[PDB]
């Protein structure tokens, strides 16, 4: 059962008459649903994402400066000017330098000086923000029936089904193989509010970093870095990463404040990560409430005869699942298919069956069955699968 | 647990290591002076009417 | 998580260092010569032979 793979697992149980079940599925969680006369089902919210969300601003973390130009005039010669002062994509500073005979001016005094640099951004040194549209966000829910077959996490359960939900398409009917149809009504509106969320992306090809972060819109909009719209050619406020030195005669130095990535990363510690897979921008945390309709589900193998009580052996002896249940797997050497005669008694009371089965109507099919998950009361018990027995101390 | 191929469900030991070096030209190096080796250069120029 | 553990690099600290260095006095290197850009010395100038 898929839910046995994780630590975060909930059990939902429907009694007599319970045909519908309302669950709050959370990313990283898993729910096992059990109900009288119904095959058990594992359900979980698998992903929350939007393909190609809209991009808000792009910020530059490392300025690439080039073509530094300086123009200086002697004290009586008027303002110094450069064509660059009027071009976008350049950062300039006008100042005054001390001039005199030493640097070829007729008078000793203040002379106009102006320096400009072309400012661009280093390749792969942008920080881009993305915003979600509640109407385009997709919630993916997976359902897997309890078939008495154990499948590891790196393996694929042939009976697992997937359902996708958007605000405009909240209901799906899934056919669970021979178990019947299950209906899922999940409301995206009951999900995570995304108004103040921005998915921040740096360079997703960097190997030792998460591919994205989920940050607050107000924090993102206040970053003190050069910015522009995707598609725009030049950067606004490029001066934020450039400093000019005090001028001396006909020269003025231009300083680059360096790569701000390290600075940003310190700010991002403790911020939740997100994930990008191609064009899909995923949230790594979130939840949604769904209504599961069980009325069309039917159990499998109810009319088989009981398996020969003499032909069972333990493939995997009873073991603690970590969810206060016991898991085990048996092998049957008799004729299939048949119902597995499972029960358990408390040490000293051989007459009362104390086993509460999670796995519905355990059966050995022609090519499956054998895995059983059950709950037992605290203390010493003995598990029986026909004549096959096993001691079990619960707790 | 069984999901990741262990017989028991519980805590398992894990250790991860990376080789750590420094990017080319990404060092910050400090230097100290020796008062006995420091040099002070002084220039003198006569007023020659030029 | 299971049999994996991610390793993260905190990135280039140059920008962080440069913020700390604002307001600190600059120095200068010319090949093998490490220069101070600020300093003083007292000298006695003998003029009798001029």
CA angle C6, C11, C13 (to 5 degrees): 145
On chain C, the residues whose CB falls within 8 A of the CB of A28 are none
In the numeric block, the tokens 């970590």 are attached to A322
What whole-number distance in Å separates Cα of residue A305 and Cα of residue A285? 47
What whole-number distance in Å separates Cα of residue A18 and Cα of residue A118? 70
Residue among C9, C10, C14 whose CB faces A259 most closely: C14
3-state SS string for A47-87: EEEEECCEEEEEEECCEEEEEEEEEECCCCCCCCCCHHHHC
Q: Do C13 and A265 meet the contact criterion of CB atoms below 8 Å apart?
A: no
Q: Do A29 and A103 meet the contact criterion of CB atoms below 8 Å apart?
A: no
CB spacing of B26 vs C34 below 8 angstroms:
no
Q: Do A18 and A283 meet the contact criterion of CB atoms below 8 Å apart?
A: no
**Secondary structure E strands in A122-232:** 126-131, 138-145, 161-165, 171-175, 181-187, 197-201, 212-216, 227-228
H or E segment to which residue C15 belongs: helix C14-20
Instruction: Kindly write down the DSSP assignment for every residue of A208-253, as one continuous string.
Output: TS-SEEEEEHHHHHT--S-EE-TT-SS-BTGGGGEEEPPPBTTB--
Structure tokens at A372: 């059983």
* A253-A259-A264-A266 Cα dihedral, nearest 10 degrees: -100
A169 beta partners: A166
Asked if B47 reaches chain C (Cβ–Cβ under 8 Å), the answer is no
Please tell me what resolution, in angstroms, this structure has: 24.0
Solving technique for this entry?
A: cryo-EM
Count of other CB atoms within 10 angstroms of residue A240: 20
Q: Min CA distance, B42 vs chain C (Å)?
A: 9
Q: In b/e form, how buried is each residue of A109-144, taking b as 16+ CB within 10 angstroms?
A: eebbbbbbbbbbbeeebbbbbbbbeeeebbbbbbbb
A93 beta partners: A115
CB spacing of B23 vs C12 below 8 angstroms:
yes
Asked if A154 reaches chain B (Cβ–Cβ under 8 Å), the answer is yes
Distances (CA, A) of A302 to A42, A179, A305, A369, A386: 21, 12, 8, 14, 17
What whole-number distance in Å separates Cα of residue A191 and Cα of residue A289? 7
CA angle A274, A279, A280 (to 5 degrees): 40
Distances (CA, A) of A34 to A151, A182, A318: 19, 14, 21
Residue among C7, C8, C10 whose CB faces A262 most closely: C10
Closest CA to A371 of A337, A350, A346, A342: A342
Count of other CB atoms within 10 angstroms of residue A49: 22
Tell me which of B1, B3, B4, B34 to substitute to probe the interface with C (most C C-beta atoms closer than 10 Å): B4
Structure tokens at A157: 């359960």
A213 beta partners: A200, A273
What whole-number distance in Å separates Cα of residue A23 and Cα of residue A196? 26
Phi-psi region of A238 (alpha: psi -120 to 50; beta: other; left: phi over 0): alpha
Q: Do A70 and A252 meet the contact criterion of CB atoms below 8 Å apart?
A: yes
CA angle A231, A233, A234 (to 5 degrees): 125
The full set of domains in chain A, from first to last, is 1-51+135-191+272-299 (2.60.98.10), 52-62+122-134+192-235+257-271 (3.30.67.10), 63-121+236-256 (3.30.387.10), 300-395 (2.60.40.350)
In the numeric block, the tokens 């017989």 are attached to B7
H helices of chain A, where? 217-221, 261-267
Asked if B31 reaches chain C (Cβ–Cβ under 8 Å), the answer is yes
What whole-number distance in Å separates Cα of residue A98 and Cα of residue C11? 42
What whole-number distance in Å separates Cα of residue A344 and Cα of residue A354? 6
Asked if A319 reaches chain B (Cβ–Cβ under 8 Å), the answer is yes
Tell me which of B3, B19, B40 to substitute to probe the interface with C (most C C-beta atoms closer than 10 Å): B40
What whole-number distance in Å separates Cα of residue A70 and Cα of residue A330? 85
A116 beta partners: A69, A92
Q: Report A:298-317 residues touching B (Cβ under 8 A).
A: 316
| CA-based max dimension of chain B | 99
What whole-number distance in Å separates Cα of residue A257 and Cα of residue A278? 32
């Amino acid at each position: 059962s898929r839910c046995t793979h994780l630590e975060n697992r909930d059990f939902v149980t429907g009694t007599q008459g319970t045909t519908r079940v309302t669950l709050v599925l959370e990313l990283g969680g898993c729910v096992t649903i059990t109900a009288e006369g119904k095959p058990s089902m594992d359900v979980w919210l698998d992903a929350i994402y939007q393909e190609n969300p809209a991009k808000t601003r792009e910020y530059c973390l490392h300025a690439k400066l080039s073509d530094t130009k300086v123009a200086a005039r002697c004290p009586t010669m008027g303002p110094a000017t450069l064509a660059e002062e009027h071009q976008g994509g350049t950062v300039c500073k006008r100042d005054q330098s001390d001039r005199g005979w030493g640097n070829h001016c007729g008078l000793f005094g203040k002379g106009s000086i102006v320096a400009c640099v072309k400012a661009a951004c280093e390749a792969k040194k942008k920080a881009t923000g993305h915003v979600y549209d509640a109407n385009k966000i997709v919630y993916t829910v997976k359902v897997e029936p309890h078939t008495g077959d154990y499948v590891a996490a790196n393996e694929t359960h042939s009976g697992r089904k997937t359902a996708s939900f958007t605000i405009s398409s909240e209901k799906t009917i899934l056919t669970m193989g021979e178990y019947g149809d299950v209906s899922l009504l999940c409301r995206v509106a009951s999900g995570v509010d995304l108004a103040q969320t921005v998915i921040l992306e740096l360079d997703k090809t960097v190997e030792h970093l998460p591919t994205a972060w989920q940050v607050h819109r107000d924090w993102f909009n206040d970053l003190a870095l050069p910015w522009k719209h995707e598609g725009a050619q030049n950067w606004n406020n490029a001066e934020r990463l450039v400093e000019f030195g005090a001028p001396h005669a006909v020269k003025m130095d231009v300083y680059n404040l360096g790569d701000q990535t390290g600075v940003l990363l310190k700010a991002l510690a403790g911020v939740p990560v997100a994930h990008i897979e191609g064009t899909k921008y995923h949230l790594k945390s979130g939840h949604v409430t769904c209504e599961v309709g069980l009325e069309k589900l039917k159990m499998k193998g109810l009319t088989y005869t009981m398996c020969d009580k003499t032909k069972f052996t333990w493939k995997r002896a009873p073991t603690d699942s970590g969810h206060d249940t016991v898991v085990m797997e048996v092998t049957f050497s008799g004729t299939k298919p048949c119902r597995i005669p499972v029960r358990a008694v408390a040490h000293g009371s051989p007459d009362v069956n104390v086993a509460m089965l999670i796995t519905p109507n355990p059966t050995i099919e022609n090519n499956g069955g054998g895995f059983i998950e059950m709950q037992l009361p605290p203390g010493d018990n003995i598990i029986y699968v026909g004549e096959l027995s096993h001691q079990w101390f619960q707790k």
